[PDB]
Amino acid sequence: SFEKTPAIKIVGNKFFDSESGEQFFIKGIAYQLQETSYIDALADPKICLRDIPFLKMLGVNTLRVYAIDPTKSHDICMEALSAEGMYVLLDLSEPDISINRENPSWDVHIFERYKSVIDAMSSFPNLLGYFAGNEVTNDHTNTFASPFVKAAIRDAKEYISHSNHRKIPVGYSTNDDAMTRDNLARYFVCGDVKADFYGINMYEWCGYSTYGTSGYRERTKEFEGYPIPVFFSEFGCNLVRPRPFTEVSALYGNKMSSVWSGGLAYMYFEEENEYGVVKINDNDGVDILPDFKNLKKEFAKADPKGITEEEYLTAKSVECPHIAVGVWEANEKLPETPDRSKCACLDEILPCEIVPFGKYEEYFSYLCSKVDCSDILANGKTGEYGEFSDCSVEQKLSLQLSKLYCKIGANDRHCPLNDKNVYFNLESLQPL
Ligand SMILES: OC[C@H]1O[C@@H](O[C@@H]2[C@@H](O)[C@H](O[C@@H]3[C@@H](O)[C@H](O[C@@H]4[C@@H](O)[C@H](O)O[C@H](CO)[C@H]4O)O[C@H](CO)[C@H]3O)O[C@H](CO)[C@H]2O)[C@H](O)[C@@H](O)[C@@H]1O
Ligand SMILES: OC[C@H]1O[C@@H](O[C@@H]2[C@@H](O)[C@H](O[C@@H]3[C@@H](O)[C@H](O)O[C@H](CO)[C@H]3O)O[C@H](CO)[C@H]2O)[C@H](O)[C@@H](O)[C@@H]1O
Structure with a gap:
């Protein structure tokens, strides 16, 4: 009761x-x-x-x-x-x-x-x-x-x-x-x-x-x-x-x-x-x-x-x-509703992935100097939110990793980041 x-x-x-x-x-x-x-x-x-x-x-x-x-x-x-x-x-x-x-x-x-x-x-x-x-x-x-x-x-x-x-x-x-x-x-x-x-x-x-x-x-x-x-x-x-x-x-x-x-x-x-x-x-x-x-x-x-x-x-x-700069920087425009299905697509199709299982900052600095990370940036001041800025940190990292991999174009399953948490996604090879 x-x-x-x-x-x-x-x-x-x-x-x-x-x-x-x-x-x-x-x-x-x-x-x-x-x-x-x-x-x-x-x-x-x-x-x-x-x-x-x-x-x-x-x-x-x-x-x-x-x-x-x-x-x-x-x-x-x-x-x-x-x-x-x-x-x-x-x-x-x-x-x-x-x-x-x-x-x-x-x-x-x-x-x-x-x-x-x-x-x-x-x-x-x-x-x-x-x-x-x-x-x-x-x-x-x-x-x-x-x-x-x-x-x-x-x-x-x-x-x-x-x-x-x-x-x-x-x-x-x-x-x-x-x-x-x-x-x-x-x-x-x-x-x-x-x-x-x-x-x-x-x-x-x-x-x-x-x-x-x-x-x-x-x-x-x-x-x-x-x-x-x-x-x-x-x-x-x-x-x-x-x-x-x-x-x-x-x-x-x-x-x-x-x-x-x-x-x-x-x-x-x-x-x-x-x-x-x-x-x-x-x-x-x-x-x-x-x-x-x-x-x-x-x-x-x-x-x-x-x-x-x-x-x-x-x-x-x-x-x-x-x-007003230094005083109030909250844009009226809000980030999008996070989309689990869109983001889950990254888990499935990306050739290069980072598992969730100090590190993040270093890897973003490295990757975002090699590829354009606009698509995962979220800016509450300017109200600009990248297309995948609603995905998880690991998904966002994996995206940039895969972009670099495709940019290199070696196509040899070597993900361009040496780390135990990085892997080549074998499902990426499977046609949808
Ligand atoms: O400031 C930058 C850092 O932000 C880190 O993320 C924090 C996050 O840890 C924080 O969690 C809050 C708890 O702090 C909050 O504690 C309650 C106290 O506020 C209150 O005074 O006492 C009660 C009872 O003892 C505490 O439980 O509990 C709420 C609700 O569970 C949590 O959301 O939230 C911050 C704002 O969302 C967030 O910034 C981040 O991990 C660091 O990397 C970063 O440096
Ligand atoms: O400065 C940022 C800080 O503000 C805290 O809120 C403060 C209050 O702590 C303060 O309270 C004062 C009392 O401590 C004092 O003894 O009496 C005077 C009145 O005679 C009180 O004002 O009041 C100010 C303004 O009203 C508040 O801003 C917050 O709790 C904290 O979140 C914040 O970081």
Whole structure:
């Protein structure tokens, strides 16, 4: 039974309980432990079942999870969360498969990761939403990554739309860099492709601050009227400890409740970073930390006054920020939808291949000085994306390798790169 967690839907710039029609406010906490590189606590009952009683004590209705393993089952933990009225916001990426902010690509390999997570998690009514990225652009030196994130939002939403699944919204989580934040917010709702919701990692309020002095009043005025639901995807500056979490009183108070859809404290687990509200001891048990009681009391007190779906309904294109060198370099034109079938054709017909099974940079420099690599380049500043720029890194390399091989024209099965990962593709010899 998922009865205690009816699906949440979006209307305008607010979330609503699809059953009751009442506005949904996130009272959340990030929940992520740190042969996958990441640990998927939601795939392991002995972990989630240990923590849910403590999560219940805190009074949260939402978790943010940054990484799941889509090859594992999640029904036990997802059902156990639902039985306690808890929802999940989930990143689609993982640390080893994410859009690289310094050298961005939107390709078949990352898109396949996104689809796998969607197919693993979409059956659960308590899946609140998916993030198609987290703090990808994080300052003025990497704004050209944002078009790739926008393409990911577009493609994730279309993949969901064309699937049998409930239409779980797809949004974005951003940092709070002063020089880029206005542009980022506009960009993710500009043109034809928009985030469904927008989360900000918000650490402006530290210690015993106030609505006016923290910056919260300024942020609230800035996001007034923003066309999609907005919330604090993280909060909980730890400058002053134990964290009193008095920001929670402001966030759910009258002024902010009309703009913000709540937020998620960072975070459940203590990881030698002084951000946890619990610490897992040597016996694998939960040791409650001084912050825990303060977060619990603040959430307990928080009673946001929202508006109902029906009354919101009877109440009611964004220009993309211009480009300026060194300041804002995210083109409105987005990379294409990665095409697994097109790219899979490279695996089959190319004479020279590099297996996935430091290296990449060196080989690109070598090959791209011998052949024209335009067809695999992706430029988020100028909005120029080569025909195979959506293929995997190895496919892109193999293409250039094969071009060089054909340019040489020796036709002797010697691929012109000495490396154990290079091979001649015998299928290339087979006529289609
Ligand atoms: O900056 C250039 C380098 O970028 C490298 O790729 C990164 C990629 O590693 C990153 O993965 C993110 C994680 O960093 C993120 O961690 C969460 C934290 O952001 C948060 O503060 O704490 C939680 C809980 O502890 C962390 O899990 O998790 C998300 C979701 O799984 C991952 O997407 O993403 C960056 C932007 O997409 C990306 O640039 C790249 O590997 C390097 O080569 C490059 O030098
Ligand atoms: O500079 C880039 C950096 O910005 C970080 O966001 C900052 C906030 O950290 C900062 O918060 C200030 C508090 O630390 C201080 O104690 O109080 C003052 C107000 O009196 C706060 O402003 O506020 C600025 C501007 O609002 C933010 O830009 C981001 O978390 C981080 O993502 C980014 O790298």
